[PDB]
Motif scaffolding. Structure first.
Motif, PDB file in Angstrom:
ATOM      1  N   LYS A   1       0.813  -1.217   0.000  1.00  0.00           N
ATOM      2  CA  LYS A   1       0.000   0.000   0.000  1.00  0.00           C
ATOM      3  C   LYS A   1       0.848   1.270   0.000  1.00  0.00           C
ATOM      4  N   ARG A   2       2.119   1.127   0.361  1.00  0.00           N
ATOM      5  CA  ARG A   2       3.047   2.251   0.395  1.00  0.00           C
ATOM      6  C   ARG A   2       4.121   2.129  -0.686  1.00  0.00           C
ATOM      7  N   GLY A   3       4.184   0.965  -1.330  1.00  0.00           N
ATOM      8  CA  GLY A   3       5.174   0.738  -2.369  1.00  0.00           C
ATOM      9  C   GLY A   3       6.572   0.680  -1.785  1.00  0.00           C
ATOM     10  N   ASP A   4       6.758  -0.198  -0.805  1.00  0.00           N
ATOM     11  CA  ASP A   4       8.045  -0.351  -0.134  1.00  0.00           C
ATOM     12  C   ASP A   4       8.357  -1.795   0.256  1.00  0.00           C
ATOM     13  N   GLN A   5       7.354  -2.661   0.159  1.00  0.00           N
ATOM     14  CA  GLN A   5       7.505  -4.071   0.503  1.00  0.00           C
ATOM     15  C   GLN A   5       8.163  -4.867  -0.619  1.00  0.00           C
ATOM     16  N   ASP A   6       9.001  -5.829  -0.243  1.00  0.00           N
ATOM     17  CA  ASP A   6       9.669  -6.688  -1.216  1.00  0.00           C
ATOM     18  C   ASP A   6       8.734  -7.842  -1.561  1.00  0.00           C
TER      19      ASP A   6
END
Lengths: 261, 261
Positions: free
Chosen positions: A114-119
Motif C-alpha cells: 500500500k506504500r510501495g516499499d515491501q519486497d
DNA sequence: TCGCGAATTCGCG
DNA sequence: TCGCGAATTCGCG
C-alpha cells in the motif's frame, strides 16, 4: 521412457503445451498403448450428470439444482474410457493453478504494498477454491475405487525449498519456504488427507476407527517448489502414470474388450 | 421455544449478534440445559491437531506440515463437550459468508461494470473457498459419526426466490434466482452431496455401491434467499438444534457424566 | 445470451 | 513478528 511415452514427452516439451493440451496428448498415448479400448476427452461436466451419478448411489443425493445449466470446467479437462458395459469411466482429471508473483517482482525493481516499499506481498487465499472441483469429481466418482484427480501448483506461494532472487540493484532477497507469509501449500493438504505430495494417490484407501469402513478420495497434489514454470514433459509423465493406474483399478470392466477384439 | 431457548433467542435478536457471538450464546445455553456436562468455545484449530487426529485413524495420514503454525479460523468458532474419557468432542462449527451486493447497488442509483452502465455485476467465485474449512473439519472428525458444520449464506448471489428492487429513479429491477449470472448456490451443493439445503444434516449417512461401505460428511447449508440480512434469533435456533443432535450421537460417551454426578 | 474461472490487494490481531 | 481471511471486478466463449 517405456515405448512411445518418451516420444510424446519430448513433443510436449518442444511445444510447451498447457495442462489442457497435455491431457489430450495423454489420451492420444493411451489409445496408442491400448488400441482395443476407446478413449475420449471432455472439457467440462454438467451438474446434471453429477446429480444423476449421486442418485444411483442413494435416492436422497443429488436433489438440488438452482441453475439448470450449471457445470464445472477443469482447465485440464477430463479423459475417459468405455467399459465392457458401454459406460464411460473417468481415467483422468487435470488442473493447474498459479499464485504468488514475488519472484517476478523481485527480478524487477518493483516494490509492492500500500506504500510501495515491501519486497514481498502477503499471500492471498484464492487457491482454496480448488477444493470445490475436487469435491464435485469426488461425488461424481463416489461409486469408483479410484480418484485420478491431479493438481499442479506453481508460484511464490508454493515453495518446498529455499531460494534467492537477485534484483536489478544487486541485493539478494532470500525467501524461506516455511514462512507463513508466502507458503499456502497447507491450504490444500486437506484434499489428500495429509498424505505425501508429488505422489500418485489414485488408488483409494480404506480406513476405519470402529467397525465402520470408510473410503478416502485423495487428490494428487504436485508442486514446483523451485518457483519455476512447470515442464510439460514431466507433467505428461505424471498424468500418464495416474491414467494407467486408473486402468488397473478398472481392469475387471475392461477385460472383454482387450480379449474379445 | 422449549424452556430457555426462547429467552436466549430474543437476546440474540435484541443485540443482532454476529455468528461468532451466537456460537458463544449456544454453548451458554448448552451448559444451562446440561449442568452435568462441560462445554468450551474456541476460535481456531491448529493444523497440528488435525494432523494428530488423522494419524490416529491411519499412520500414513496427516504427515504434511509446511508452515508449523498453520491453522483454520472459522468466523463462527467451535463448540465442544468433554466426554467420559476426558476427550473434547466437537459439537458445533459455524461459518457465515457474503457475496453479491446488487441489492445495495440497485437501492441506490449505482451502475456497475467497466463502462458504468450495468444494473448487475457478474457474480464471482470467491465463495468456493468455503470447501477448504469443510474439508479440514471433516478430516478432524473422520472418526466421528456426526458432522455439525453449519454454513450461513446471504447476498444477491444466494437467492432461492424472485425479488424486485426499486431504484431512486423508480424503475424496478426484477431479479430471477435461477439465473446463472448471479446465483452461486450450486458452487456449494457438493458440500452436502446434493441433499436439501436449510436442513440439519448433522447425522452422517452410510452408503455403498458394492459391498464397500462409505461414510458421508454432509454440511448444513443455510441461505437467506430473500436477499435480506440473517436474523440472529433464527441463527441461534438452527445452531442449537445442530448442537443437540451432536449430543444425541455422542450420547454413549456422555452417560457416565449425566448419571454419576 | 449465460455461466465458470482467474487469483488478486490488503485488513486484522 | 506472522498467518488467516474478506469476497471482489471482469475476461472468456
Amino acid at each position: 521412457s517405456q515405448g512411445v511415452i518418451g516420444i510424446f514427452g519430448d513433443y510436449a516439451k518442444a511445444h510447451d503445451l498447457a495442462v489442457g493440451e497435455v491431457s489430450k496428448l495423454v489420451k492420444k498415448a493411451l489409445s496408442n498403448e491400448y488400441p482395443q479400448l476407446s478413449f475420449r476427452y471432455r472439457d467440462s461436466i454438467k451438474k446434471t450428470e453429477i446429480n444423476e451419478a449421486l442418485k444411483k448411489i442413494d435416492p436422497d443425493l443429488g436433489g438440488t439444482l438452482f441453475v439448470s445449466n450449471s457445470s464445472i470446467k477443469p482447465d485440464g479437462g477430463i479423459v475417459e474410457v468405455k467399459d465392457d458395459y458401454g459406460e464411460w469411466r473417468v481415467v483422468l482429471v487435470a488442473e493447474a493453478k498459479h499464485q504468488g508473483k514475488d519472484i517476478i517482482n523481485i527480478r524487477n525493481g518493483l516494490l509492492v504494498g500500500k506504500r510501495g516499499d515491501q519486497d514481498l506481498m502477503a499471500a492471498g487465499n484464492a487457491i482454496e477454491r480448488s477444493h470445490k472441483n475436487i469435491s464435485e469429481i469426488a461425488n461424481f466418482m463416489l461409486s469408483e475405487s479410484h480418484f485420478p484427480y491431479v493438481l499442479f501448483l506453481e508460484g511464490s506461494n508454493f515453495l518446498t525449498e529455499n531460494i534467492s532472487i537477485t534484483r536489478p540493484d544487486g541485493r539478494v532477497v532470500n525467501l524461506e519456504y516455511n514462512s507463513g507469509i508466502l507458503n499456502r501449500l497447507d491450504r490444500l493438504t486437506a484434499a489428500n488427507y495429509g498424505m505425501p505430495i508429488n505422489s500418485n494417490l489414485c488408488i483409494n484407501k480404506f480406513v476405519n476407527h470402529k467397525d465402520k469402513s470408510i473410503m478416502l478420495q485423495a487428490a494428487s497434489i504436485y508442486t514446483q517448489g523451485d518457483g519455476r514454470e512447470w515442464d510439460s514433459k514431466i507433467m505428461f509423465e505424471i498424468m500418464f502414470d495416474i491414467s494407467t493406474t486408473s486402468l488397473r483399478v478398472l481392469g475387471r470392466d475392461l477385460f472383454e474388450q482387450l480379449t474379445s477384439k
